[PDB]
Amino acid sequence: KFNVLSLFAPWAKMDERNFKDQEKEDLVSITAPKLDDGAREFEVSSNEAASPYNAAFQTIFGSYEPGMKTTRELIDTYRNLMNNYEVDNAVSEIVSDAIVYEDDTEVVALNLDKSKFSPKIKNMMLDEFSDVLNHLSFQRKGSDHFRRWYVDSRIFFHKIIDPKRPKEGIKELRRLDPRQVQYVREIITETEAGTKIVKGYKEYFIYDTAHESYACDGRMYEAGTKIKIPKAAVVYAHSGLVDCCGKNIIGYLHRAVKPANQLKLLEDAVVIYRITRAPDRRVWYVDTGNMPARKAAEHMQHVMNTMKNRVVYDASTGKIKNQQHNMSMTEDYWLQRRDGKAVTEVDTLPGADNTGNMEDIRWFRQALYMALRVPLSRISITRDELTFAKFIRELQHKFEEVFLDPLKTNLLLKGIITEDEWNDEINNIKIEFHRDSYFAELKEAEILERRINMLTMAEPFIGKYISHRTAMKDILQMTDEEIEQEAKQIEEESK
Amino acid sequence: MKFNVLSLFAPWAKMDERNFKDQEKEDLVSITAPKLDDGAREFEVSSNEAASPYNAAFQTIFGSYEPGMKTTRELIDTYRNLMNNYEVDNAVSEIVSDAIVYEDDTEVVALNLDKSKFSPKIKNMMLDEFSDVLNHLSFQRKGSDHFRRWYVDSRIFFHKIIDPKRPKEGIKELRRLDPRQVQYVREIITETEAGTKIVKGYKEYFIYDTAHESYACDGRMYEAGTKIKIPKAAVVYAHSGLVDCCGKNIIGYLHRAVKPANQLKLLEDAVVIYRITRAPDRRVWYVDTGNMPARKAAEHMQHVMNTMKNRVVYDASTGKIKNQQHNMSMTEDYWLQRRDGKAVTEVDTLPGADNTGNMEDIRWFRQALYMALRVPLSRISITRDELTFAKFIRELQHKFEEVFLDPLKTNLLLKGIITEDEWNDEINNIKIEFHRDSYFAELKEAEILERRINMLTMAEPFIGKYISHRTAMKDILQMTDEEIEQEAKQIEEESK
Amino acid sequence: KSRQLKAAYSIELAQDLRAVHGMDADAELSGILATEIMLEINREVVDWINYS
Amino acid sequence: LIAFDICGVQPMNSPTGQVFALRAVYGKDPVAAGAKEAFHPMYGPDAMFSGQ
Amino acid sequence: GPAVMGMVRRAIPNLIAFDICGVQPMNSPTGQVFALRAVYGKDPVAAGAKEAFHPMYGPDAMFSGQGAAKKFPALAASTQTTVGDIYTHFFQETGTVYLQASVQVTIDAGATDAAKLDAEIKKQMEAGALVEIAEGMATSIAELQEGFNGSTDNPWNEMGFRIDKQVIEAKSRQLKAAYSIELAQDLRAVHGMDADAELSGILATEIMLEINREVVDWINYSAQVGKSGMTLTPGSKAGVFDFQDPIDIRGARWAGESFKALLFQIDKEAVEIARQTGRGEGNFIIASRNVVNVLASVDTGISYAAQGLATGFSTDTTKSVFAGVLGGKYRVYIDQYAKQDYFTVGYKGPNEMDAGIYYAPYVALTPLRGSDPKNFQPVMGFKTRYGIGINPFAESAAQAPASRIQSGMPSILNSLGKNAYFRRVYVKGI
Amino acid sequence: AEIGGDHGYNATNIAAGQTSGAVTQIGPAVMGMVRRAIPN
């Protein structure tokens, strides 16, 4: 091809190299897609005398595009769930715990405590990492980036390169708009009774242009075409959450969508029951029996436009509009009827009765609240708190790719580091982060108190049953080195 | 190998063929029922098989699929349908979390060769191979997902690979198989005087055969396609030993929760509609318009209908009543005219969404469900349920563990580090250990010690009379004699 | 407006094609028909452009 | 083939669907003999209509 | 439920599978087998070409020898021999024989068919008039072979071989059930039947039974008839073994000694088969249940005499069809559907291509399911395709086929009553 | 219809892969070959 989309020429080269590496792999005799999550794969089967990929093309084209449509419905819903009470806070609390940032604290930070080529590289990597965060304006908006990942289920960015001197002119990322990118995988290979090949898949992505106005959807249209761009150009990450099957990725709030809507529906039902029929209610009847409509209509008016009340509540000021004083001792009604029969009379209707016992609405509200992935302690430390800490850590960990990706990209292009080195280093180059230190300190303190309590009880037996070395490692949970260090420090302090 | 069918897997065919023949050589005979304890479906063949090539295998699959695995596929979909709901998925999360522990600055599931082996060099090779299995699976990051899927669908499967150019060092990354696509079987390759009880190497093969031509869920554009027959050696798998009353139609632990999972879902929705319905007002008008064709009567019906209809809604986006300004009247004045001589025209009201609960059955069922999902009752110190779940989990781990033992021996044996005979004698113990939550482990140990200290304290006044200190250490502190000497020796050192 | 085509083929043949060329060719028939229809449409569009 | 490269799609959700359009016209009569559009590209605007 | 007394149905008979024939699993239709025929006379493919090796024919003892120099006069009806000369004759069986004349006599001038001429020659041989003879070639002749020293017309006899082949094709068979919904529903309500599965069973069963029955019939169809020719007792009834006729039992009476007579003939027939195929003594017999009842009641080992109950070999056709092994030597199967009373014997080797009769499955028991929307009644059925064939050389009489190519499938011309691997015996008088 | 067709049971046509329908054949699989035993 002529690479008409010169926009990504350097990224295309990066994908070509990776694609070639896959072609040179021995990953054959594989019936499986070899995939777990992310980009949507399909049988674009080619490079064989059958050309079935044409059906695959036509399927994507002819059916454009329930994948992204569903994605929009889910995201739009996710936002609409977040818009209500409790969901709003659950998200906020989670986002805050995932990224805690305060005066003079630590940010997500690359911890290179594992073997590297040189300390010089360790510093280069950390400096680049800092710039990745600066590119993301992490210190100001890290929370927003995470929130979108959590809520919309995915985060993604466009990487920007020069392109004149692409390994040098490396620029900051452009956070991409949710619902605008389709991630895909193409099985471009075939063999005896179906492919059992490497299936490199390219794993590229396609950007759907859109220009919604006040539409709040692609009301008239989004913006025509979409551009196929090499995967090297996009940073992305997503939750480990899908529909029953496929690459039908969902957000963290998806699990709660059922009860979220049930609760809202129930709440609206409570309100409607309570407001409806609050006013007085009554229908006047008029006996116009054996009269033409031409006359009956006026005889009806003789009561209807005469016994009609004149009262409405002033909700700006709690007064009855134009009613002074405020209330009579009685409402005087009267009626004359043609005969001794209950035809021309007034029949009142049921009012806004009380029902709940708002226990059902509560049962659902409580189930929902917990369904938001939050502790039941909210509206010292228990198993749930520990669980949430693990949860938050995991969320941060999946999200983390958002830094590792642009990090390797820039480091590899500068080369600084090679691809082989990157692959050997990670493995583990984990990015650690600031956690709520208030609570962390409390945790550590309670653990220590317990350790002290155990030692205190042990005390009478130390010189007969439980030695020091043992007590320190078993009761106070000190390492061997820690034990020697504590002894040495004491010897110094003692002088 | 009568024909080189799917030569792609010839290395696996070689492994299975080898094993099949070795089984035939061995006197694995005089057995009444097929020697199959658990796992994949049974099928019988004639003496000297007379049931090959793979086309015969397809006969087996049809008979084993049409009335068989098709049901299994429904069960797999059911587990997903179960998990898709809340008050379900979280039980799984709790189980997965307990099953695989992830902690900072420590290890993850690891091979621990602390029992006799030929040499440390061999042990080190085994430890490296284990690590590569985890590396292949990115287990240290995705282990939770691998396990979760195993638990939830009651089965995990991974396709193994041999180069094959230089097959000696052939194991590379494992590939998870798509759920529902593959059936496994064990055929009885023998016949005698009505009811063979002799040796068969049972084939141990499997066939993949799905198509997106018929959807379980739309949006899918790839599948197995035709019937592909691959040797057992080619895969790694595990499942729980849970089956139905007959056959080999494997189910999960969560199967037990299907009943109440849906009873709860059903009750939840019933409750919602019970209360939502009739929340608005409700009224039916009856109009005495006779002696007219519908084309005329309709005018009179519209006269009333477009006058008495309170053409408003409740704005649920913003809590307001549409066009209702000012906010609320002190009354709603309605009117009707009658044409007959009797008070027949009227408007009836319907009873409304009142509240009759007593909303307690749903609570009972939810509790029953939560329990059904295999959870402790401590959830919405140390107790029996927690100890029980620690046991449930070590069994889940013990079974799951084959996911590592299998590719471990496979690559060790493939390279030649150890032999097959050695593996069988060595395990026994080639155990893989899972990390345990250090926080809770410390607490458990601390309580045990506290009790031990308290009992020692109580014994104290009688040590020089009735209870030797050696004995107290042995029974109260539960120490071995070597441990007692070690503590005495360390104390002597501390004192100096 | 609509379009439609059929395969109308022998099962026995498919059984043998698998044996002969490694081709079940049912997938092939599906691909052929699909290919032809989308191809026929593509041309249709081009001609409407030419016509208009 | 050239699948849709130079064409629109506007896929259906109903067979035999419908499209609409709106023309801006002048002279206070949406439908009239001799009626003209406010902005047709091949015809200049009537600068005197709003003027002398 | 007025005291339902359960129900009955017929049992399904067993099969002899392919225990006594080739199985040739196929992965394609229409396979092929070829063969090499050692041949001599300077043209491997020719009318009159002679094969170097054959189970029923003697070698040309003077081919590399004196026959290289000179032709020998042939024997023919009415001619007179000359004492001391050597005459040649190719017999219908026993092949090339060179006979020196001890006398000057004529041979059956009234002979017509070769069979009559062969018979008189055999008598002259028995009589000592004609004696088997061979010799090498005088060395003084050999000395100038290939035209040396001005000599002519002295080539050496040459040998070579001809490779040719035969092919097969698979024929098929299919059946449907064409059953109804209402019947199946009633059956569910009577016995708890699925009434599709039972039908599936029936159809698949019938197909398998037919195939196996077909193989047996092909065995009977191609087998040669025994108690004939070289295995014939001249005072016998030609192809049939009796118990009521002393000629077949060497005057026996007293079943303990009489029944053994059949075993004797069986060995003779099994041995002749080896003589016909060149591979080995027959190793399997299939016979009427009455024959087997006799075999199972006689001590088949070598002993003075002995008789008892039929306990030596399973005799039922209700559990199996395989009775057991006769003398530890032949696999005994029961022809559960024998039309009269008899028994076929034959030889099958360890080599799947060494069997005479071959079965070669390609497609089998493919189930089919659907329903006809006009009344929505179900349709179900099954399909099989395989093909069978015969051994090149099964006829054995001919040294080679026409045109270097033939169908490997049986036909009347190809094999009825001709197959070297099997022989028929009719049985009467039990 | 897309009938593969069949052979005429004519050995020539079988060997040559000639059929009556849409698809001709590559040719017959080799099932092996025969040589005769040598007399002892």
Author numbering:
A (entry chain O): 2 to 380, 395 to 510
B (entry chain P): 1 to 380, 395 to 510
C (entry chain D): 262 to 313
D (entry chain D): 106 to 157
E (entry chain e): 92 to 521
F (entry chain d): 66 to 105
Text of the article:
Three cryo-EM reconstructions of the T4 portal region were calculated using different symmetries: a 12-fold-averaged reconstruction of the portal protein; a 5-fold-averaged reconstruction of the gp23* capsomers surrounding the portal; and an asymmetric reconstruction of the portal and surrounding capsomers, showing the portal-gp23* interface. Each gp20 subunit consists of a crown domain, a wing domain, a stem domain, and a clip domain. First, the 73-residue-long N-terminal portal region, which was missing in the recombinant portal structure but now fully resolved in the asymmetric in situ portal vertex reconstruction, is critical for attachment of the portal to the capsid (red). Although most of the in situ portal dodecamer structure obeys 12-fold symmetry, its periphery does not, as it morphs at the points of contact with the capsid subunits. In total, the gp20 dodecamer interacts with ten subunits of gp23*, two from each of the five gp23* capsomers that encircle the portal. The gp23* subunits strictly obey the 5-fold symmetry and show no significant conformational differences except at the N-fist regions (residues 66–91) which are disordered in the five D subunits because these N-fist regions now face the portal rather than a capsomer as in the rest of the capsid where they are stabilized by inter-capsomer interactions. In contrast, individual portal subunits undergo structural morphing and show large conformational differences in their N-terminal regions, Arg185-Glu204 hairpins, and Asp209-Lys227 loops. Our asymmetric reconstruction shows that the portal subunits form a series of salt bridges with the gp23* molecules. Remarkably, however, the portal morphs to form similar salt bridges with the capsid subunits, by adjusting the positions of the loop regions of p + 5 and p + 7 portal subunits relative to subunit p, and compensating for the +/−6° differences at these positions of contact. Each cluster consists of Met1 of gp20, and Met98, His282 and Met284 from a gp23* S subunit.
The viral portal vertex consists of a 12-fold-symmetric dodecameric portal complex inserted into a 5-fold-symmetric capsid vertex, making it the unique vertex of an icosahedral viral capsid. Eleven vertices of the capsid are occupied by pentamers of gp24*24, whereas the unique twelfth vertex, the portal vertex to which the packaging motor or tail are attached, is occupied by the dodecameric portal protein, gp20. Early genetic studies showed that the portal dodecamer nucleates head assembly by interacting with the major capsid protein gp23 and the major scaffolding core protein gp22. Here, we report a high-resolution in situ structure of a symmetry-mismatched viral portal vertex from bacteriophage T4, which illuminates the key interactions at the interface of the 5-fold capsid and 12-fold portal.
